[PDB]
Ligand binder design. Structure first.
Ligand code: HEC
Ligand code: HEC
Ligand code: HEC
Length: 68
């Protein structure tokens, strides 16, 4: 879909499925075939989201992703 907000206990986080793509052109998050990647407090903190953010001047902070 477009903007998807993950309402977890530690602050909701906002996947701008659209706005990220309006820069990043799907492929950036999706190796050729776009599909539902399992996002969790495992994935989202290990590599998914993180490594891209790390690779730029990303919001490298908990409150940088989570509303608080
Ligand atoms: C990385 C930040 C992403 C961008 C930018 C795009 N997608 Fe994505 N997509 C991403 C995740 C984290 C997920 C899982 C969402 C969930 O809770 O299941 C997805 C999922 C999809 C899906 C599933 C169906 C849907 O979202 O309606 C598809 C088909 C999909 N993504 C397509 C897609 C396209 C076409 C993108 C460019 C406009 C795109 N995604 C960007 C992560 C990210
Ligand atoms: C690169 C492949 C990215 C992935 C994967 C994710 N994000 Fe991201 N994010 C990315 C960029 C380039 C930026 C914006 C930088 C500037 O001009 O471009 C962001 C920013 C965010 C933000 C902050 C928005 C703001 O007000 O600046 C959020 C909330 C964010 N990203 C969340 C987010 C999540 C939760 C992701 C995985 C589900 C994720 N991003 C992946 C690049 C990339
Ligand atoms: C954006 C790239 C994130 C950063 C930086 C951090 N977190 Fe995160 N976190 C992110 C996502 C996409 C999720 C998904 C929701 C889920 O419940 O898995 C999470 C989840 C958490 C949770 C879980 C809360 C719950 O209800 O169980 C916590 C406790 C959490 N995140 C904490 C947290 C902290 C302390 C961070 C800084 C070190 C942090 N997150 C960074 C995305 C992102």
């Amino acid at each position: 879909a477009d903007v998807v907000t993950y309402e977890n206990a530690a602050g909701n986080v906002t996947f701008d499925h659209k706005a990220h793509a309006e820069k990043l052109g799907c492929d950036a998050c999706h190796e050729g075939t776009p599909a539902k990647i399992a996002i969790d407090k495992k994935s989202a903190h290990k590599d998914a989201c993180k490594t891209c953010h790390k690779s730029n001047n990303g919001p490298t902070k908990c409150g940088g992703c989570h509303i608080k």
